[PDB]
Scaffold this active site. Sequence first.
Site, short mmCIF file in Angstrom:
data_model
loop_
_atom_site.label_atom_id
_atom_site.label_comp_id
_atom_site.label_asym_id
_atom_site.label_seq_id
_atom_site.Cartn_x
_atom_site.Cartn_y
_atom_site.Cartn_z
N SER A 72 0.83 -1.21 0.00
CA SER A 72 0.00 0.00 0.00
C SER A 72 0.87 1.28 0.00
O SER A 72 1.70 1.48 -0.89
CB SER A 72 -0.92 -0.04 1.22
OG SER A 72 -2.06 0.79 1.03
N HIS B 169 -7.51 -6.26 1.18
CA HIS B 169 -6.28 -5.47 1.22
C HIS B 169 -5.52 -5.80 2.52
O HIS B 169 -6.11 -5.76 3.61
CB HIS B 169 -6.71 -4.01 1.25
CG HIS B 169 -5.58 -3.02 1.31
ND1 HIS B 169 -4.86 -2.66 0.20
CD2 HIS B 169 -5.10 -2.27 2.33
CE1 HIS B 169 -3.97 -1.74 0.54
NE2 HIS B 169 -4.10 -1.48 1.82
N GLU C 3 -9.34 -5.83 -3.02
CA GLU C 3 -8.76 -4.64 -2.42
C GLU C 3 -9.75 -3.66 -1.73
O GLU C 3 -9.47 -3.10 -0.64
CB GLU C 3 -7.96 -3.86 -3.47
CG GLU C 3 -6.73 -4.63 -4.00
CD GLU C 3 -5.53 -4.52 -3.08
OE1 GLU C 3 -5.67 -3.95 -1.96
OE2 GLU C 3 -4.48 -5.08 -3.44
#
Lengths: 526, 526
Positions: free
Chosen positions: A196, A436, A323
């Site tokens: 990320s 995610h 995600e």
Amino acid sequence: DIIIATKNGKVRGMQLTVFGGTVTAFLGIPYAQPPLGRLRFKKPQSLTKWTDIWNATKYANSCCQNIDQSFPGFHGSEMWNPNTDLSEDCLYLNVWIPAPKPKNATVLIWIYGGGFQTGTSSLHVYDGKFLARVERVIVVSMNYRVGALGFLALPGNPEAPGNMGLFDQQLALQWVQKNIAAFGGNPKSVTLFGESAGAASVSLHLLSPGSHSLFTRAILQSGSFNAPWAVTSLYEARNRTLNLAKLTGCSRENETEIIKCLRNKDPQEILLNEAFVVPYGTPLSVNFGPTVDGDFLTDMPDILLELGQFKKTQILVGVNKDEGTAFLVYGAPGFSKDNNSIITRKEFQEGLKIFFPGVSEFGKESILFHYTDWVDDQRPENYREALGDVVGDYNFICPALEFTKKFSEWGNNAFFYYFEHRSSKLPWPEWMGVMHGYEIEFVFGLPLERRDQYTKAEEILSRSIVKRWANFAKYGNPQETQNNSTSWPVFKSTEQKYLTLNTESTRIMTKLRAQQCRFWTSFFPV
Amino acid sequence: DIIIATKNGKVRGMQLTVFGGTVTAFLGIPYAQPPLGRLRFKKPQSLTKWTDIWNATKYANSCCQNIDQSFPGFHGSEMWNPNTDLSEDCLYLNVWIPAPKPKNATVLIWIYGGGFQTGTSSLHVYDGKFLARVERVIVVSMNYRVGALGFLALPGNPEAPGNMGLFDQQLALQWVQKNIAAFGGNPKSVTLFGESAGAASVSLHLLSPGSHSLFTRAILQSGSFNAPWAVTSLYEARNRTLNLAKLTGCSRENETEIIKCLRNKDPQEILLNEAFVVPYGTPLSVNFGPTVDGDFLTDMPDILLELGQFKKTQILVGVNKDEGTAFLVYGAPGFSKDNNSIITRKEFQEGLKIFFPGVSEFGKESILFHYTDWVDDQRPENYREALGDVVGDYNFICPALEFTKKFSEWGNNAFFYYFEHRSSKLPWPEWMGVMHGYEIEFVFGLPLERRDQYTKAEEILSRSIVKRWANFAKYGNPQETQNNSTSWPVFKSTEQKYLTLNTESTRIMTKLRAQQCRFWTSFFPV
Ligand SMILES: *[C@@H]1O[C@H](CO[C@H]2O[C@@H](C)[C@@H](O)[C@@H](O)[C@@H]2O)[C@@H](O[C@@H]2O[C@H](CO)[C@@H](O)[C@H](O)[C@H]2NC(C)=O)[C@H](O)[C@H]1NC(C)=O
Ligand SMILES: *[C@@H]1O[C@H](CO[C@H]2O[C@@H](C)[C@@H](O)[C@@H](O)[C@@H]2O)[C@@H](O[C@@H]2O[C@H](CO)[C@@H](O)[C@H](O)[C@H]2NC(C)=O)[C@H](O)[C@H]1NC(C)=O
Ligand SMILES: *[C@@H]1O[C@H](CO[C@H]2O[C@@H](C)[C@@H](O)[C@@H](O)[C@@H]2O)[C@@H](O[C@@H]2O[C@H](CO)[C@@H](O)[C@H](O)[C@H]2NC(C)=O)[C@H](O)[C@H]1NC(C)=O
Ligand SMILES: *[C@@H]1O[C@H](CO[C@H]2O[C@@H](C)[C@@H](O)[C@@H](O)[C@@H]2O)[C@@H](O[C@@H]2O[C@H](CO)[C@@H](O)[C@H](O)[C@H]2NC(C)=O)[C@H](O)[C@H]1NC(C)=O
Ligand SMILES: *[C@@H]1O[C@H](CO[C@H]2O[C@@H](C)[C@@H](O)[C@@H](O)[C@@H]2O)[C@@H](O)[C@H](O)[C@H]1NC(C)=O
Ligand SMILES: *[C@@H]1O[C@H](CO[C@H]2O[C@@H](C)[C@@H](O)[C@@H](O)[C@@H]2O)[C@@H](O)[C@H](O)[C@H]1NC(C)=O
Ligand SMILES: *[C@@H]1O[C@H](CO)[C@@H](O)[C@H](O)[C@H]1NC(C)=O
Ligand SMILES: *[C@@H]1O[C@H](CO)[C@@H](O)[C@H](O)[C@H]1NC(C)=O
Ligand SMILES: *[C@@H]1O[C@H](CO)[C@@H](O)[C@H](O)[C@H]1NC(C)=O
Ligand SMILES: *[C@@H]1O[C@H](CO)[C@@H](O)[C@H](O)[C@H]1NC(C)=O
Ligand SMILES: *[C@@H]1O[C@H](CO)[C@@H](O)[C@H](O)[C@H]1NC(C)=O
Ligand SMILES: *[C@@H]1O[C@H](CO)[C@@H](O)[C@H](O)[C@H]1NC(C)=O
Ligand SMILES: [Cl-]
Ligand SMILES: [Cl-]
Ligand SMILES: [Cl-]
Ligand SMILES: [Cl-]
Ligand SMILES: [Cl-]
Ligand SMILES: [Cl-]
Ligand SMILES: [Cl-]
Ligand SMILES: [Cl-]
Ligand code: NA
């Protein structure tokens, strides 16, 4: 007893038993002067000798940061919250080395995510003793400043120039260049990896002339600088610095006086006003992020990427199947981790407002038009699935694909993965799917530890991923060559081949999200 | 009232309401002289004028054949059993035409499967009124003789020359050449399609010089002549003809006397002894099948395929995800349609004996070695899944892939599908997955009928498949061009691209069953 002599002094580490073997961990070595007082908001300053045996036997303080209090008591969210005291004195790094001490080991340097507003290297899912044990690589990870304290920007002004937290990461990479041979590491074989915002950071070190010679290869998990949350414009940054000033009664006419005033505020008053420097935020807001500062970042990074100005090397890039789901429970209407979140068309539309603040009405209809032509209108989880895909495709998946496409056009090998395994232990509910952040524990090897209640198929998946990441770092090629594994093809514009990572068997596919990303990538940028 | 003048006489049809429109069905038109008495085991003889309005208003008799009595009362099996009286007088065909009568419609000719031992054109899943209505093609289907009566072979001897049931199909194709313009059909645009043994038959009409000019293109669903059950050697056929003779007290010294004797037996005594002409059979036994007769089939068809001697045209070829499961409940130990069939290693090994009669011990260990390296040994359905894949890969999937590979090497476009949708109404249990035979109802359009309790996603899947099959027949290209569909690439040696058919979204993939078929195709042929 293990003492290593570094350029700045001696450090003592500690021995760890892992899988019937030994790893030496040097937790919490300092890499810069504490950025306190008059050094607050400034670029990190180099460190002077202690002398002195520094005891690196526990994780250091994490940098100041707001914490996620949405689900007190809940492991799914609280697992990301810091687990050492918060303090401005947080510029430390960790080194894990195989035992016996390696001769010239490849180095993996982890850069954590957290939206540039949060995160710490001491989290359990970032523990690099499994990698060091199993692959005989050295793992390094560093705390860097986050929020206003790491990214406040008053452009061109060295009192708050911006990107400080990116300069912290950079000074850590130098420390590895100068010091890692002493621990048995090869400074000429260094791979950065990050997830990320940590990935976005990796992608900007690829563009940064001052990082060019501090590393060899790069791994980007769920992030790249071209994601819509990852770079703050100069306009926004100015507005935000001034809004912060205003909110802390630090408004001045002279800008250096603003900074001086802010240097007198308590860490806490700064943290408390961060969330408001912006009229409306989203669950994906990055109020204080990377900016084009003329130093770390010399030009808008989209221009650098398009025109091929970046470190020429191999990259490994990937994303997870779901995600966008993690974010929907932090403010989308009708969504809950505690039920199946079947929402309605009208709710879906309200969600777009949460995630696309403004965003013309036409902009938002266009998302709706693109994502709600069902096949068919029967399925009740239709709108719930659609909102998650909107959020994931826009924020993570298409920007990762477009980065990989543009990077590879200049002639470098790039490898792309699509991670599609839901952890048997995920604490979040089923509808949120392969979330995610949840490939990370696989990359770090946690499932290799049987005592831990992962399935056997998950141990095997993790073992394979670890080998592939390690071969990428050591040799620039993420193959698992021994167990008749699927061969991972390079990603090229044209075919856009990618490898799926799952417990059953991995496939080569092509053109991930082709129709979706044509929307986000060509049209949406309304 | 609809009367069509054919070369052999007039025929009256009947009007059918389908989807608020009309189709005209001419059910049970005769296409050869009944092959009774002295014509038993002989090639079909051409038909002479009636005159006379033949009433084609119901399905004709099905050919004599043993019936599946394993699951009396059960729809899953009984749906394949004949639904008109059995009789040697079974040489009829069916024509369905759009209304109003088309001008020069493309023709689809269906050839049923059933192991060459069973089947009939009147089954409900082969009803071609949906295709005619929806795509405005003409659908034709014919009964051809099966079992000993269709395939008994005493090589070179015109009293029982072999392949009679393949010559029945061929005389039906001529009838379409001579007569279909009268119903509004284009004899220059004829596509054969067939499933399992019906597909194998389609693949042999591609190799047969006498069929070359009786059709344009070919569709092969779950079958091709190179499958291990689809062609009987001359050795085996001789042994089997004599074994039948022996069992019916028809043994003679003069072979023409054997046949003469067998021509005196009752249909039933022949049927009853078919199963035993062979020392051990399997659930996939084809006791009386195609042979190299020097007439229909001029040389071992593997040689013809390898050396490119076949009709040069486009082919559409496919298989289902779980081909082999259907067969396991007809004799593999531990298997039942009525529980989840979790079998043991020892059971798996017993199953190989059922399916690979002999088959050296080394042969059977080699299957076991190839299919039982688990990832990992945890999963209890391990051995149950493995036996189904063994049976499907060997019998259907790899021979279809290898046919497509070899056919395409001579320069023709070929398209390959992998059908992976389990019907919402399948009566068989879940563990059997996407079974052999169960794409058929999708190809014929049954899910287009809403009154029928298929889901909406299934209507849409069927509608797409029907369009793709129809465009293949009319234009040689199985695209669905209007609804932003995945484009179906040609299959080439080298990439071996195929299209997956499922309700969610269809993918292009490559090298189906690569590792498995290397085993069946290169090594196994022990
Ligand atoms: C730059 O900032 C202003 C917002 O002014 C802010 O004052 C800060 C101290 C902070 O408390 C913040 O919450 C407050 O908004 C943005 O314009 C704002 O737009 C809304 C629309 O109604 C107004 O209600 C705000 O007050 C208004 N600003 C004011 C008070 O003049 C502006 O959008 C922002 N520019 C950006 C987005 O970069
Ligand atoms: C799934 O839950 C959501 C989340 O909100 C609720 O959390 C639940 C577990 C429950 O404790 C409830 O009290 C809590 O507010 C539900 O969304 C809510 O729907 C309720 C029903 O009226 C509304 O009153 C709320 O405004 C709305 N919450 C918000 C602010 O988002 C949701 O309805 C529920 N849906 C299901 C079960 O499918
Ligand atoms: C050719 O046939 C013989 C089998 O002889 C058969 O007699 C038939 C009328 C029929 O009833 C059939 O069931 C019977 O087997 C095959 O050889 C056979 O192998 C087994 C092994 O023990 C013996 O028990 C059989 O009797 C034996 N034949 C005999 C009786 O001599 C032979 O394999 C077959 N050739 C093939 C397979 O093509
Ligand atoms: C699943 O069923 C099979 C099939 O055989 C059985 O069918 C069952 C539904 C039941 O009515 C039973 O009476 C019938 O025979 C079972 O295989 C059988 O296992 C039994 C248990 O001893 C044996 O006695 C049989 O020899 C064997 N059947 C044969 C001949 O194949 C099977 O055990 C069962 N397995 C499960 C539930 O996982
Ligand atoms: C350590 O190796 C140095 C060269 O490293 C190369 O080899 C691989 C590690 C590869 O990943 C690349 O990163 C490098 O180009 C060599 O120059 C040093 O002398 C070695 N140091 C030792 C053994 O002390
Ligand atoms: C009917 O069309 C005849 C030619 O058919 C071609 O066109 C397509 C149908 C195609 O699929 C190919 O099979 C053929 O090559 C033409 O010769 C006839 O004259 C037409 N008959 C009519 C209209 O009466
Ligand atoms: C530093 O810590 C180590 C490890 O716990 C301990 O053994 C050592 O004595 C310490 N040295 C000092 C006094 O700092
Ligand atoms: C702004 O104030 C700072 C305070 O030290 C000073 O250094 C700088 O010269 C001032 N510039 C002006 C005139 O705005
Ligand atoms: C290869 O498979 C073996 C067992 O067959 C397993 O123990 C080993 O960890 C695997 N190696 C890798 C790197 O996947
Ligand atoms: C043939 O069958 C049709 C349709 O049922 C009927 O109307 C017609 O009279 C019949 N003709 C004869 C007598 O065969
Ligand atoms: C075999 O018998 C048939 C019976 O008609 C006869 O036609 C044929 O000539 C005979 N051939 C011989 C001598 O085997
Ligand atoms: C195309 O999709 C429409 C609705 O958008 C559907 O009604 C139609 O049947 C489809 N056509 C084909 C051939 O799939
Ligand atoms: Cl955890
Ligand atoms: Cl609306
Ligand atoms: Cl639906
Ligand atoms: Cl996709
Ligand atoms: Cl049915
Ligand atoms: Cl054994
Ligand atoms: Cl397992
Ligand atoms: Cl496969
Ligand atoms: Na648009």
